[PDB]
Structures are given as C-alpha cells and as structure tokens.
Amino acid sequence: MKLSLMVAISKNGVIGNGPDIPWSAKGEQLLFKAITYNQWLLVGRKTFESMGALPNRKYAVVTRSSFTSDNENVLIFPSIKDALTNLKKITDHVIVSGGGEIYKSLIDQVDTLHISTIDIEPEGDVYFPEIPSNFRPVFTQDFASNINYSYQIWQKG
Amino acid sequence: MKLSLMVAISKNGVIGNGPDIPWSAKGEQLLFKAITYNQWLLVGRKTFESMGALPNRKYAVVTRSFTSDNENVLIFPSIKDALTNLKKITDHVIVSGGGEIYKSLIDQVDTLHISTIDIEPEGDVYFPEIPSNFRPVFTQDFASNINYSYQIWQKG
Ligand SMILES: NC(=O)c1ccc[n+]([C@@H]2O[C@H](COP(=O)([O-])OP(=O)(O)OC[C@H]3O[C@@H](n4cnc5c(N)ncnc54)[C@H](OP(=O)(O)O)[C@@H]3O)[C@@H](O)[C@H]2O)c1
Ligand SMILES: NC(=O)c1ccc[n+]([C@@H]2O[C@H](COP(=O)([O-])OP(=O)(O)OC[C@H]3O[C@@H](n4cnc5c(N)ncnc54)[C@H](OP(=O)(O)O)[C@@H]3O)[C@@H](O)[C@H]2O)c1
Ligand SMILES: CCc1nc(N)nc(N)c1C#C[C@H](C)c1cc(-c2ccc(C(N)=O)cc2)ccc1Cl
Ligand SMILES: CCc1nc(N)nc(N)c1C#C[C@H](C)c1cc(-c2ccc(C(N)=O)cc2)ccc1Cl
Ligand SMILES: [Ca+2]
C-alpha cells in the first residue's frame, strides 16, 4: 500500500489556527479535490470534524476516544497502527490529509508529498513537521490568486 | 517561459470525436480545473468553440480566419505569434488542445499532464507520440464510472 500526503503550508510553516485553516487561497482547494477524488484519506479526528464527510471521498479517522459516525464511507480506528493494518487489506493507496498530529506521526512513512506553499504568514498554532532529507521535488507549478500559491510534488528516494 | 500540456487520452488513442470528447469520466475534470486555474491556455479555434471561455482561465486562441469580445480571450493569427506575445506577460502557458495544436507543440513543451481514460470510444482526433526524452515522475490511479489514471511527465 502506497501512502501519499497532501497539505497546504503557509510561508511561516503554519497549517492551522485552532480548528481553522488561517487563510483562503482561491483555487488551491481544486488541487485537494482533484487529487483526493474517490480516494481513501487518513485523517485525525479534529480534521475530520472540521472537514466533514465530503462526497466522493472515503475516510479513515483515528481517535483515542469513543468517536463514532454512521456514515458508510467513514471507518474509525483507535490507533494509526490499526488504521494502516486495516487499510492495506482494502486499498492500494491512502492519502494522509491532516492534521498536524497525523502529519507528524506519518511523515517518515509516506511515499509522495503534495505540498502547496501558500504566500501568507498567518497567525496559528499548528505547524507542518520537518520534511525528511530523502524527499526531492519532481514537479512545480505556480498560481496567482487572491493569495498566491505554488504546488509541488515530492518523491521519496 | 515554460510550456505545459494537458490532455485526456482514451485507451485506444482517441481524444475527440468531431467537436466532442467521447466520454464522461466523473472526477477527471477536477484535474483539468485544478491545473488550469488562473493559467494561460493555448488552444486551437475548434477546441475553443467547443469549450467556451470558462471562468478563471485566460485563453490564447489561434485561428487563420474568428473573434471574441471576452476580455480573458486573446485571438492570435499563428502559434508563433501567440507564443511571442505570451512570453511578454507570463512565464507559463498550458497547451490545452486540440489534436492540431498538440501535434504542433508537443516537441516544444516541458511538462505533460496525461490522464489515461479506461474507455475505447469512437472518434477521429488523436494525440502524438510522447517524445522519447520525457519520463514519468508522478502517477495516480482513480476508480470512477470510467476509471482513469493521471501521469505527469517531465522533459529530460
Ligand atoms: N493543509 C492544511 O493546511 C491542513 C490539512 C488538515 C488540517 N489542518 C489543520 O490542522 C488542525 C488540526 O490538526 P491537529 O494536529 O490539531 O489535530 P488532527 O491531527 O486533525 O487530529 C488530532 C486527533 O486525532 C486523534 N489521534 C491523533 N493521534 C492518534 C493516535 N496515534 N491514535 C489514535 N488517535 C489519534 C486524536 O483524536 P481524539 O481527540 O478523538 O482522541 C487527536 O486529538 C486544524 O487547524 C486544521 O484546520 C490544516
Ligand atoms: N483532453 C482531450 O481529450 C481534449 C482536449 C482539447 C480538445 N479535444 C478535442 O480535440 C478536437 C478538436 O481538435 P482539432 O485538431 O480538430 O482542432 P483544434 O486543434 O482545437 O483547432 C484547429 C484550428 O486551430 C487553428 N490553427 C491550427 N494551427 C494553427 C496555426 N499554426 N496558426 C493559426 N491557427 C492555427 C485553425 O483554426 P481556423 O480553422 O479558425 O483557421 C484550426 O482549424 C475536439 O474533439 C475536441 O473535443 C480533446
Ligand atoms: C484546500 C485545503 C488543502 N489543501 C491542500 N493542498 N491539502 C490539504 N490537505 C488541504 C486540506 C484540508 C482539510 C482536510 C480540510 C479541508 C476542507 C475542505 C472542505 C471543502 C472543500 C471544497 N472544495 O468544497 C475543500 C476543502 C475543510 C476543512 C479542512 Cl480541516
Ligand atoms: C476535462 C477534460 C480534460 N482533461 C484533461 N486531463 N485535459 C484536458 N485538456 C481536458 C479537456 C478539454 C477541452 C479543452 C474541453 C473542456 C471542456 C470543459 C468544460 C467545462 C468544464 C467544467 N467547468 O467542468 C470542464 C471541461 C469542454 C470542452 C472541451 Cl473540448
Ligand atoms: Ca505558427
């Protein structure tokens, strides 16, 4: 099973401010929608609650509490180990989709990074982890918008 | 200025049937929307007539005849003139079809965005051979009503 990771990181490293993404870069959300269409997303419970079960995605959510959801496209796991064990029986690809805790847990395990660098320095208290030295960018594209952003794909090895 | 190219190719090589793309692969259009957002698109006149001036894109349309009063659409008399003028205002253009424009520009583009669509349709518009100096650098498969696979190639 392949693990991808997709995130939008502002220029000071902030990805979140409490429950919010502290910016709106019009058009960048299209990248996220396109890459996650009909994919399995691995998300922390906090991010899952902020995003909801958007249509045409499948969600593996990790929680330490009794969190539940009766949506048939949502599977809830009590650990990341259990999530990954179960996911590899049912899919060949999972996209790690946040938030800070889940990114920090799994950054050393993922194969492909989708990073949109957002041209803003917002307030916030959630940051992206350091990127292991063995990742290299293989694709870059710049976008002008209300907040500019640059989309880069990194490959491991 | 860098040139990209974006296309969806069916399993038997068809990209069009007259003025239409002969499939509807739910989800694949999201890739096209995402990569072209606020970009300059170079398109042939026939493709521009089939797609129209969709919001949040800028169009360089080539014709030997045809006009548009849309402020986001530029009409050029040649691909050469389109490229000469685009380099004055942007560092990136996306070649977005159709068959004639792909054939004329494939040897000049730096990055390919190719979605392979799992259907074998009828049609009469095709895509050129990928030049041998291109290498795939990213691939992802999608299951949908018609499956599709997305691949980015870089010129080396
Ligand atoms: N691209 C972006 O910019 C982007 C992408 C995603 C989200 N975000 C932001 O990131 C923030 C949320 O990130 P976050 O770090 O605070 O929380 P998070 O990673 O989304 O979720 C944290 C929660 O997941 C559960 N969890 C974490 N590790 C676990 C483990 N090993 N086993 C079992 N459960 C585990 C716990 O849920 P329980 O509390 O239920 O036990 C934890 O409280 C938001 O601001 C959000 O907007 C930004
Ligand atoms: N991803 C996909 O599957 C995809 C993407 C886009 C398009 N398509 C398909 O491709 C088909 C259209 O392709 P096509 O080859 O027939 O037409 P096209 O490439 O879209 O346009 C051809 C016309 O562009 C003008 N032109 C071509 N070369 C020129 C040059 N060097 N200088 C000035 N003008 C030039 C001419 O316009 P005038 O006749 O006005 O002189 C020509 O008739 C449609 O089926 C469309 O659906 C498929
Ligand atoms: C577009 C932001 C982004 N960009 C990149 N590059 N990577 C990422 N991981 C994310 C993200 C995220 C979290 C998961 C999220 C997403 C959403 C959400 C809701 C609706 C839409 C839509 N199009 O309607 C889009 C996104 C809401 C809250 C959160 Cl917390
Ligand atoms: C999505 C298909 C695709 N995929 C990839 N990978 N590459 C490509 N170049 C294309 C294409 C195309 C031509 C240019 C086109 C596009 C459209 C059109 C109109 C509206 C929307 C929308 N807003 O949903 C989307 C597409 C209509 C006719 C044509 Cl002839
Ligand atoms: Ca020409």
Author numbering:
A (entry chain B): 1 to 157
B (entry chain A): 1 to 65, 67 to 157
What did the publication describing this PDB structure actually write?
Two plasmid-encoded dihydrofolate reductase (DHFR) isoforms, DfrA1 and DfrA5, that give rise to high levels of resistance in Gram-negative bacteria were structurally and biochemically characterized to reveal the mechanism of TMP resistance and to support phylogenic groupings for drug development against antibiotic resistant pathogens. TMP is a selective inhibitor of bacterial dihydrofolate reductase (DHFR), which catalyzes the NADPH-dependent reduction of dihydrofolate (DHF) to tetrahydrofolate (THF), a necessary step for the recycling of reduced folate cofactors. Trimethoprim resistance in Enterobacteriaceae occurs almost exclusively through the acquisition of plasmid-associated dfr genes that encode intrinsically insensitive DHFR enzymes. Expectedly, all three enzymes form the stereotypical DHFR fold with an eight-stranded β-sheet, four α-helices (B, C, E, and F) and three catalytic loops (the Met20, F-G, and G-H loops).
Like TMP, the PLA binding mode is dictated through hydrogen bonding with Asp27EcDHFR or Glu28DfrA1/DfrA5, and the propargyl linker forms π–π interactions with Phe31. However, unlike TMP, the bicyclic moiety forms van der Waals contacts with helix C (residues 43–50). In both DfrA1 and DfrA5, the 2′-chloro group makes van der Waals contacts with surrounding residues Ile21, Thr47, Ser50, Met51, and the nicotinamide ring of NADPH. This orients the biphenyl ring system such that it lays adjacent to helix C, picking up hydrophobic contacts with Met51 and Leu54. The binding pocket of the TMP-resistant enzymes is not capable of accommodating UCP1228 in the flipped conformer present in the UCP1223 structures while maintaining optimal interactions with the diaminopyrimidine pharmacophore. Critically, unlike TMP, the PLAs preferentially form the ternary complex with NADPH in their respective DfrA complexes. When superimposed, both structures of DfrA1 and DfrA5 complexed with UCP1223 and UCP1228 show a clear density for NADPH. In comparing the DfrA1:NADPH:UCP1223 or UCP1228 structures with TMP, the Met20 loop is found in a closed conformation rather than an occluded conformation. A comparable enhancement in cooperativity of 4-fold as seen with DfrA1:TMP was found when NADPH was titrated into DfrA1:UCP1228.
